[PDB]
Each structure stands twice: as structure tokens, then as C-alpha cells.
């Protein structure tokens, strides 16, 4: 019960001592058990996610928190099988699923055969295509056709909804082809908010070129997915103690992809944060600490975005800093700190993000541990905080990227293998957790959260300097 003392859990070198990786692992086992009892996933709008919410809520209530379970409307998307695409005119041709074409995430289902009509294309190296970005691009578009649209300038959602409003029966978006690396298939989405009502697929650039030059082309397009208008939930709790006008917020999404239990992504962040919150119940913070477990992150940051957008302006101004923990137990981990200062990738967070990054950096360095930057281009639940000008930072142990030889020297593990080879897969279970990674990153989570709970001055100083 020594870690029930406020003297330990209130201070930045005390909280990490009391936040033990073995206790995070026990919570990870519980999430694993939950997934196993609910068909192997904890995905948004599933019983696995609901049972994860119940677990987090009950844990927080037993620690003395009041808990807000915040519902929001949500259109779930599930691909139910591979797509089909074949030419019927002028000649029969069968294109290959996941080589010539793929789904847009959040597309509607459909089965359509129709003439293919290119819309305002701009081909070739160095093009700046605006294909389909304006309703006027469809000036000569015949209703019922398949719109053949080039990637470029505006969102896929906008291209597809413009085509739908112009009466398209379906949409084929092909990669832009302005550089050699923008000619293949990619992970692309029309967004959870897509409402075009028609199917949308993505195709390679060279296929787009050939189709756009094929007189009388007709394509038979089949998209086998389900979208379901439903709801899901964020879980939010805050300390009773601490200044309510200077809130330190920490977040970790609680949903998994549909394909697996999501123990590293993001059981790891969820369980470390839950352990910290339980310990902080006894702390004496100067600044209020708010904890969020986000829903529907894997569908496009839906829960965290909804939370921020729905905050009254006066309440939004009270959040001084946001810390995001999304994947911190990677089997082949590296020590990645969000690149708030843009020193590695050229994107700066809102004023104060450099200070948060610097706090993480100094903590790893003090411990003789290596670290390096990772990108912050709206990849996780800080995104809407970023858009709202709120300072943020975070920790990451790596996902599908391949470990370099240097990083294996710095962090151990295997060069040329993914940081997490079970990323978004059935095998992302309890066995997919590296407890050294959990130890190192839950330590730093606790240190920086505790530090800011006592003083946000490092953040305040950058805010002040930015104002002049």
C-alpha cells in the first residue's frame, strides 16, 4: 500500500516507481480475455468494445472516479469480401483484386456495370490534377456512368460525393501519377462521413491512364461491404483535485481493428493509462488530469474528433496539453517520441508541443536510453487537438515500419523486421507485447503526466513566446 501514499504518486519520479509493467500486463491479459469472449476483437460497435468499456469504467469507479461514457453517432464499415472489377466492352478483361484496384475505406456496397467517363484528368509527371474537385468538372457527365477520377488536390470524399451528386453509379479513383511513388494502390478512405451512396474503388495510375483512353469502355464493378449507422462511446474521467482551468489530458484509443484483439494497438496505451489513472486517484496534482479512452479511432479518429469538436469553447480553452499513447508495447520496439518541434519531419505542433517533446527526450536521456522522432501528421487521436491549437506530444514503439540496423543497435531486436509484425492482425494478442517496451514507455507516460500535473510552465512559456 506504499503506492497509496500521495507522497509517491504525486511526484514525477514517484509515479513511475508505482506504475509497474507487470500490473499493466495483467490489465492487458484482461483485454485479451475480453476479446476472446467476444469473437476475437474489440472493434467499434461490437460486444468486445462494449466489454472493454465496462472494464475501464468499473476499474475507474472502484478507484473513486466519476466516469462519463459519452456516446456519439457512428457509421461502422466492414468489408465482407474482395471486390470485383472487369471490363465488358470493348473486350472482356478481369482485373486483379489488391493489384489493379482496392476499396476505398468506408465505401458503400454496390454492383454496377456502366460506361466509364473520365472527369477533368491531368496526366503525366508533375501534374497538379484537380479531377472531380469541382461540380463544374461534371458539366458533361451522363447520369448513371462510372466516374473515372484522378487523385489530386482535394479529398477522395469530395471527389466521390461530387460524382454522386452528378448522378454517377460508381466511382473509380486512380492514383495521381505525378511522381513515380504515386502510381500504386494505397490505404485510402472516403471518410466515416461519406454520404455519396455509391461504391468507390481505388486503382493504379497506369490502369487509370489506359481506361481513360479506351473508347466505349464499360466496367463491371462489385464492392462487397456493409455500412451500418450506429453509435459508439468514449470513456472520460478526471481527477477531483487540480485546477479545472488548466487541464492536462491524456488519451489512448480503446477500440481494436475488426481483424484482431488489438492488444498492442491499443491495449498497451489503454492499459498503461488505466494503471496510471488508478494510481493518480491518490495524487495531489496542481493541475487537473483528465483521462480519455477513445472509441472508433481505427475508423478515422471518430471518437477523439467528436470529443474535441463537441466541447463548448469555454471548456476547450481549459485543456492546456494533450498526451497521446497509441502503441507502446511493440514486440520489435523502438523508442519513438512525437516530433513536436518538426526537427525531423518538418511539421510543428501547436506552441508547447516542442516543450512536451523535450520533456520526453530529457527523461529517456537521463536514463541512458536512446530515442528518436516519429511523425505527427494526424495519424492518431491528437489530430483534432492539433487542429484546435492545443499543445500535444506522445510516445510510440513502432508499427508496420521496418527496423533499421542502427535502430537495432539502439533498441535491440531485429533489423529489417517490422516494429510490430502483428500490426492490425489476428496475432496482435497478449503474446505480441514486449514488456521492456511497456516498462520504458509507461515510465515516461507517468513522468511527463506527473510533471505537467504539477506545472505546465514549459508549455506556457512556448505559448507566450509564440504570441510575439
Amino acid at each position: 500500500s506504499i503506492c497509496k501514499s500521495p507522497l509517491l504518486v504525486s511526484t514525477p519520479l514517484g509515479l513511475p516507481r508505482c506504475l509497474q509493467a507487470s500490473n499493466v500486463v495483467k490489465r492487458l491479459q484482461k483485454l485479451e480475455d475480453i476479446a476472446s469472449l467476444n469473437d476475437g476483437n474489440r472493434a467499434a460497435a461490437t460486444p468486445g468494445y462494449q466489454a472493454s468499456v465496462d472494464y475501464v469504467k468499473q476499474t475507474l469507479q472502484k478507484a473513486g472516479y466519476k466516469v462519463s461514457v459519452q456516446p456519439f453517432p457512428f457509421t461502422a464499415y466492414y468489408p465482407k469480401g474482395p471486390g470485383s472489377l472487369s471490363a465488358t466492352v470493348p473486350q472482356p478483361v478481369t482485373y486483379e483484386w489488391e493489384k489493379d484496384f482496392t476499396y476505398l475505406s468506408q465505401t458503400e456496397a454496390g454492383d454496377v456495370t456502366a460506361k466509364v467517363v473520365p472527369v477533368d484528368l491531368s496526366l503525366g509527371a508533375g501534374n497538379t490534377s484537380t479531377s472531380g474537385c469541382e461540380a463544374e468538372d461534371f458539366a458533361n457527365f451522363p447520369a448513371g456512368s462510372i466516374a473515372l477520377i484522378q487523385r489530386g488536390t482535394c479529398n477522395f470524399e469530395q471527389k466521390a460525393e461530387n460524382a454522386a451528386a452528378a448522378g454517377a453509379a460508381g466511382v473509380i479513383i486512380f492514383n495521381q501519377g505525378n511522381t513515380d511513388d504515386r502510381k500504386g494502390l494505397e490505404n485510402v478512405t472516403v471518410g466515416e462521413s461519406y454520404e455519396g451512396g455509391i461504391p468507390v474503388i481505388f486503382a493504379t495510375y497506369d490502369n487509370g491512364v489506359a481506361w481513360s483512353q479506351t473508347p466505349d469502355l464499360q466496367l463491371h464493378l462489385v464492392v462487397d461491404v456493409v455500412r451500418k449507422k450506429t453509435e459508439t462511446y468514449n470513456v472520460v474521467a478526471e481527477t477531483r483535485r487540480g485546477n479545472p482551468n488548466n487541464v492536462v489530458m491524456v488519451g489512448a484509443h480503446l477500440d481494436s481493428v475488426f481483424e484482431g484483439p488489438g492488444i498492442n494497438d491499443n491495449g498497451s496505451g489503454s492499459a498503461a493509462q488505466l494503471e496510471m489513472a488508478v494510481l493518480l486517484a491518490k495524487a495531489l496534482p496542481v493541475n487537473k488530469v483528465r483521462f480519455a479512452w477513445w472509441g472508433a479511432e481505427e475508423a478515422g479518429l471518430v471518437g477523439s474528433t467528436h470529443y474535441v469538436q463537441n466541447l463548448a469553447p469555454e471548456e476547450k480553452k481549459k485543456i492546456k496539453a494533450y498526451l497521446n499513447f497509441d502503441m507502446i508495447g511493440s514486440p520489435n520496439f523502438g523508442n519513438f517520441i512525437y516530433d513536436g518541434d518538426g526537427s525531423d519531419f518538418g511539421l510543428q505542433g501547436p506552441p508547447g508541443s516542442a516543450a512536451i517533446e523535450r520533456l520526453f527526450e530529457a527523461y529517456f536521456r537521463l536514463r541512458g536510453q536512446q530515442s528518436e522522432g516519429t511523425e505527427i501528421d494526424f495519424r492518431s487521436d491528437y489530430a483534432e487537438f492539433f487542429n484546435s491549437g492545443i499543445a500535444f506530444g506522445g510516445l510510440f514503439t513502432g508499427a508496420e515500419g521496418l527496423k533499421t540496423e542502427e535502430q537495432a543497435q539502439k533498441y535491440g531486436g531485429t533489423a529489417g523486421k517490422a516494429y510490430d509484425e502483428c500490426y492490425h492482425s489476428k496475432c496482435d494478442g497478449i503474446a505480441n507485447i514486449n514488456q521492456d517496451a511497456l516498462e520504458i514507455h509507461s515510465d515516461a507516460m507517468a513522468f511527463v503526466t506527473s510533471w505537467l500535473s504539477l506545472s505546465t510552465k514549459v508549455v506556457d512559456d512556448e505559448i507566450a513566446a509564440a504570441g510575439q
Partner: peptide, 9 residues
């Protein structure tokens, strides 16, 4: 530009 896992444009 990303918004989470996927490119939105």
C-alpha cells in the same frame, strides 16, 4: 494527408 490510418486525399 492522413486522418488516422488512411489517406483522405
Amino acid at each position: 494527408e492522413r486522418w488516422g490510418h488512411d489517406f483522405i486525399k
